[model samples]
Target: VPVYIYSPEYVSMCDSLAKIPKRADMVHSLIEAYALHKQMRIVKPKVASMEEMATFHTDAYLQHLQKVSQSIEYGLTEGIFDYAAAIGGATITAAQCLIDGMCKVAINWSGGWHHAKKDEASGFCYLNDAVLGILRLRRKFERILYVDLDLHHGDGVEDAFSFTSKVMTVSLHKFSPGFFPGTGDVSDVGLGKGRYYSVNVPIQDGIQDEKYYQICESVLKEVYQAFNPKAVVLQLGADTIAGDPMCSFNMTPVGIGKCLKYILQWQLATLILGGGGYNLANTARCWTYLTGVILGKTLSSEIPDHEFFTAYGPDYVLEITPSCRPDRNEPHRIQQILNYIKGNLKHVV
Candidate 1:
């Protein structure tokens, strides 16, 4: 089975600081009500040392996160550094378990803060746990594949390894003018030795299941052949799903589930992380369903009674439908993007 990273402290700390205040509690409660916790081995994460964090973040920023204690830099509150350290530690722990052969799959729902940079926080992400975990994996694995499914671009993680060939970052996101952070164009391939190593799939609104899955499957097949990584880190951000308060993509959990299935078929040591899920109920359902997918268990479509039962009212079901919006990603445009990404893969080696 897989390892599920959780602790009372981890849940509460994340709940208190995250943009969606009760998000951690909602996700945990739903997963528990579904009883997914019974099957997986729960691992308690240790706090990351200054050195472990220093592996990716700058020393000056690290000190700044800790200094004056309460100036509210980076739009973060006090104890932000401690929370970031804990998140970093959780992800590094999962990577360690994979490296040591303790588990083939590691689940850290609190760890995919892909928007965090080396020197500053952005998009409510205080630290780049995805990068921290990948760095830990790099100690043993020659190459690590970071796949981002967030609604917004995973600019921070891509920036972290944009110049290094050892890590290949593939991000699929909503990219347009005036969007948040506003990076990740298809033409923005990696530079220097990292050319073609940074792959960006800039998507439009209302992409449906088959269309989205087609792009993921096609590009990933090319990446698998070209990069041939030893390990993979998947950031499953739920904001892309339909009915999200953010309302970017016309996707259900099944859409994301298809992509998860494809990645799981790779059978590599995989780290699953959470990011950019705004709507609390759908976010919970999405991750809970994904956790079930990882465990090879069929979860009931009917919502299980949990501490947060009222949240999933009306439908009271695990599955949600895509909105009335039409699929905006045109056939020829998609093919061209796919072709461009596949062409870039040829340069990866």
Candidate 2:
């Protein structure tokens, strides 16, 4: 099975958030240096058509994004509409790849841009490729399960499918009411036929690897049994790892790799997308390691040399153990979180 990439074209999409362009290449360059590139094929996907892109957004909103692109005066605006669209285009291509049996899974780092609404944007994200890609999947399968493991809630994808039973969304995120977009209350199981289909598992800060793994295992084990989805969409965000500039969860890249292992065991036709990861080095390492996991390839921890290869050092190893304190939130909080979610499982079952 090969993977698709819309790079060189996508890399030109340098934004006011300049760190992102570098983050985009971290895993890509690693795949090259580690010689993993030989194992698969890379593709340059077409830009999404108006009809395909518009399925998840309103026409007027698309106009608004384009106008915003033209308004960049002093390197102020985010990347252009085409850059974001290219990422969405690649995801749409990924969906088609699965349908064509070209690959069991398809990936896009610029994807899981799962924050844009039909009318507005939030969380530094513009377009919602996960929504767009899932919409493409809906043309084939009646039931799709979306799992988000980002530090923040996947509000865009959840909101897009909240009214339908055909798509089930689950998110595990840092849920302080004080943070950026805080609406994934465990009680917010979807509205009608989608009730209990939108599952939110909120956790506190400083949560370590074993505990994080425990929660993922228990919640996902139940989700798989209950939903029995025809396919899955994954948002693998590295911000939850302790050293990330944007988060406080004490997760390691290895821990995240293990979480991915949980899902890969199912061998489902999965669409994997990247979401939030503020720390560039860790984000790159995590995604690189997981790509190897996806292909069942064993990678050496020693990162091979390349132009940007010097970036991973002081300690240039592929593995990471985030140096952070132990969990501070009370055990009762997680226990209650578990109980609330488990109680809701009855509705799904």
Candidate 3:
């Protein structure tokens, strides 16, 4: 059986703001469509209080977010802000569950707004759920490890903990000369005591599946052994999959599925997150597959029809592969990354 950090805000508010790409229903509905909802418990969670949010953000920012009528200095009074907070609260709840042993593993399918910062919003994100969740883990767990698998770099989380050795953040993302939020260079290991604690695997266009599995699994194994982190928070962004509207990384849902399998095998207290999937159809497929992996119930790849059934089209399955994307990341390029990470890992101990 599987357990999830349950939320009602997803059903109530997300429909009103259906225009946002991070639709809550796409995740739950897809999992429900497969008839897995009955097997999992509805682990209800409390909203992150102002005090908990202030652990990583400013009180002034919290006031703006709360829209304390007297404070019009910031925050748009829109459902976006409310929905973002609701998701942030759910993420914190999931993280707390990991610590309390209610669940060693949990998924915040609607969270992982990793681009938001302490004072301002970035990349259409109003608040940083990953930051708040990681901070919550710090109160109960030592040496928290943060992994970002989004196509775009998770600069906000890295920046939030860049100066501390308590948290080690590894970002696997597509990097280029003109990508958004130009951060997470391979050499940017961090500053002061935080050096070598921040890891970046800067990937290029049209990467392969085995390449992802090999490098990511190797890095994760090394970090877990060396860092001996008490807990890990993973941001599983689905945009890096083959048919993404942005970025050129060519990966499949199977690539992500196997990567999660390796992470779960370690049994480190883990909190799984959702991130950066522009195409909801493929995004739905990706997370659904992962949920199955966690539950040990692999549904038939031939996806059953649903309301947005046509969205999956032609194939109408739970699989994704590359057809036209070219493999621009040469063999030596990836080898160099492996060599660099192996060498840098020496400092992790």
Task: Choose the strongest candidate by TM-score.
Answer: 1
Q: Please give, for residues 43-132, the per-residue lDDT of candidate 3 as tens digits.
A: 876666777778877877877776632332332335565666677788888887877787778777777888888887677667899999
Residue 32's lDDT within candidate 3 is: 82
Reference-based lDDT, each prediction: 0.90, 0.79, 0.80
Residues 305-337, model 2: lDDT tens digits: 876777877788888876757676687877788
Model 3 earns a TM-score of 0.93
| List of clashing residue pairs for candidate 3 | none
User: Relative to the unseen true structure, what is the Cα RMSD of model 3?
Assistant: 2.3
Model 1, position 114, has a per-residue lDDT of: 91
What are the runs in model 1 whose C-alpha is more than 4 Å off? Answer: 68-76
Writing each residue's lDDT as its tens digit, candidate 1 over 1-349 gives 7999999999988887747888989999999998999999899998899999999898878888877345355444678888888999999999999988988899999879998888887898888999999999998899899999989999999999999999999999988899987999999997898888999998998898888999999988999999998999999999998889888798888889989999999899999999888889999999999999999899998888778989997899999888999777889988999999888898877
Q: Find the 10 residues in a row with the least total lDDT in model 1.
A: 68-77
What clash count goes with each model?
0, 0, 0
Lowest-lDDT window of 10 residues in candidate 2?
71-80
